[PDB]
Amino acid sequence: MTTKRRNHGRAKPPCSRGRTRPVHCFNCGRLAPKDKAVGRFVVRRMLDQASARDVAEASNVYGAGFPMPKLYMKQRFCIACAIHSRTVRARPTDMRKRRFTTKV
Amino acid sequence: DSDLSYPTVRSERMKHKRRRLVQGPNSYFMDVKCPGCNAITIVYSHATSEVQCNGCATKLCRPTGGKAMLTTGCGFRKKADH
Amino acid sequence: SKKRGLTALRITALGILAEALLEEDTRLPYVATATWTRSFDAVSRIYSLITENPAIAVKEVFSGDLTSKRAVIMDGLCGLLQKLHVHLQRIAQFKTGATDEY
């Protein structure tokens, strides 16, 4: 029917680029362009708060104020995959048009 | 204020050189003396070549950029536009 | 400079080498010691060539004045030696007599 976004769900304006590379979803292995796919960056604890105490206790290096390793990765979700897992949600047709830069 | 047949200073001096009501140049000439001789050569501000000192040869400029840049130790007066 | 056994331009080649090395430095500014000597040495070797087998001055072109040869021509004359005199004064002029440099 209409147009629901000015962008067209992309980070590509016209008269700029023809094709941007496809990429492989974190979940089901679907594909979509880099621009369409939703990026996030995780910064994920190796262990729980609970668990970390019960390890650091024994440990000869950890819990001196020396921090225990964390796991870093990036994740690129498909549109269906995203909305499913509730990374992103449907929003009013007044709050649909909003941005938050890259700041978390 | 600011008639378009009689503009100020500000409302000209900014603008690109074809977008004035005059369409003047943007450049000038100069005189230049080398340490190695007594001469005056007459040199172009946006020279866009290496120019050998009149009666000598050593190069008074480098052709570099959109504005050419004098070889070191050579003194330079300017000239009129009129 | 060594060419292949000749010494014709060798003379010209050694000439430009001394003149180029002496000028460049980019600090602090000035030159000292090693870099000052690697122009002096060249000038002495040039003078040796001039003394000896020369005069005679052949292949390419030689003169002496005016057009281009050109440290050769400035060593005519001897503006080249003048540039060594200038630069030595410079070195001295900055460092105050104390340590062994003097």
Partner: protein, 135 residues
């Protein structure tokens, strides 16, 4: 017992490879080279059920019976290397860790220098599945 002739009551480190996946856990134990082993005990063995191989109970019930050997070999302390399913498989690990580690540490082993060593490709060919994914 078959333990070290070196020292007494002074730490002897082994290396422990904790393989986490969604369909199994492993615990494995080696010296430092990894050319020689001491244990190779897997979550699966401690359960009878395909379903419950990877669930946290299984993991812990391996880890116990690993340290039940390692002590006799004279391994006091450990160094621990945590791994996830594959390079074209998931960077995220299974739920078989936060199980494993929290057993070992309270089994009277020491711990130091936990690491994450897992395959990360510079690039790969194709992930298994299709353009439309599993659906």
């Amino acid at each position: 017992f078959y333990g070290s002739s070196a020292a007494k009551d002074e730490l002897v480190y082994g290396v422990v490879h904790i393989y986490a996946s969604f369909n199994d856990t492993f615990v494995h134990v080696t010296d430092m080279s990894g050319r020689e082993t001491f244990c190779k005990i897997t979550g699966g063995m401690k359960v009878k059920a395909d379903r419950d191989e990877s669930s946290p109970y299984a993991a812990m019930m391996a880890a116990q019976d690993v340290v039940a050997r390692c002590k006799e070999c004279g391994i006091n302390a450990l160094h621990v290397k945590m791994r996830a399913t594959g390079g074209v498989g998931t960077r995220s690990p299974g739920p078989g860790a936060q199980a494993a580690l929290r057993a070992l540490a309270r089994a009277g082993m020491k711990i130091g220098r936990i690491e994450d060593v897992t395959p990360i490709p510079t690039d790969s060919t194709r992930r298994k599945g299709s353009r439309r994914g599993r659906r």
